[PDB]
Paper text:
We previously observed that the [name] domain of MAL (MALTIR) forms filaments in vitro and induces formation of crystalline higher-order assemblies of the [name] [name] domain (MyD88TIR).
Here we present MicroED and [name] structures of the MAL-induced MyD88TIR microcrystals at 3.0 Å and 2.3 Å resolution, respectively. The SFXa map showed well-resolved features, including water molecules that were not modelled in the MicroED structure. The MyD88TIR SFXa structure was used for the comparison with other [name] domain structures and for the analyses of interaction interfaces within the crystal. The structure of MyD88TIR within the MAL-induced higher-order assembly exhibited conformational differences from the known NMR (RMSD of 2.4 Å for 107 Cα atoms)61 and X-ray (RMSD of 2.0 Å for 118 Cα atoms)62 structures of monomeric MyD88TIR. Analysis of the crystal packing reveals MyD88TIR higher-order assemblies, each consisting of two offset parallel strands of [name] domains, with subunits in a head-to-tail arrangement forming each strand. Based on the [name] structure, the intrastrand interface involves opposite sides of the MyD88TIR domain, which together buries ~18.0–18.6% (1500 Å2) of the total surface area per subunit in the structure. It is composed of interactions between residues located in the BB loop of one subunit (BB surface) and the βD and βE strands and the αE helix on the next subunit (EE surface). The interstrand interface buries ~12.0–12.2% of the total surface area per subunit (991 Å2) and is composed of interactions between residues located on the αB and αC helices of one molecule (BC surface) and the CD loop and the αD helical region of the partner molecule (CD surface).
Author numbering: 159 to 296
Write the structure that this text describes.
């Protein structure tokens, strides 16, 4: 009922979401992620439970940013709603992930939040340690 983070993803990035489940749930971090295609029951109002899960039942929200995520309206809503809870990002609530290269622009409304970048080969080592640490805090 209480998760550590809600995972905002478009269907195309399900591969990386499952890699996240392996890396954060099924290891010593013992984190509890909310994945809509696994944990959200059918018959729920896509907007009502999105709002209910992200605001009350999930402590933070991780957003998987890609070219395909920009074309998702379900994600767009979820991201703008996540930003509403801390416009200034004082609560360190919205966690942007970049896992692969993007031909298109990083969302304008997210441009002053520290991205967990998995593309840069020189920083990749600290990606999982930093992300797990971010989700583990109150």
């Amino acid at each position: 009922e209480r998760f550590d983070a809600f995972i905002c993803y478009c269907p195309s990035d399900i591969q990386f979401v499952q890699e996240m489940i392996r890396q954060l749930e099924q290891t010593n971090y013992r984190l509890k992620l909310c994945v809509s295609d696994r944990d959200v029951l059918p018959g729920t109002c896509v907007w009502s439970i999105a709002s209910e899960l992200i605001e009350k039942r999930c402590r933070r929200m991780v957003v998987v940013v890609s070219d395909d995520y920009l074309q998702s309206k379900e994600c767009d809503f979820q991201t703008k709603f996540a930003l509403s809870l801390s416009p200034g990002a004082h609560q360190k609530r919205l966690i942007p992930i970049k896992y692969k290269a993007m031909k298109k622009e990083f969302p304008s409304i997210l441009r002053f939040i520290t991205v967990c970048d998995y593309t840069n080969p020189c920083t990749k080592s600290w990606f999982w340690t930093r992300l797990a640490k971010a989700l583990s805090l109150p």
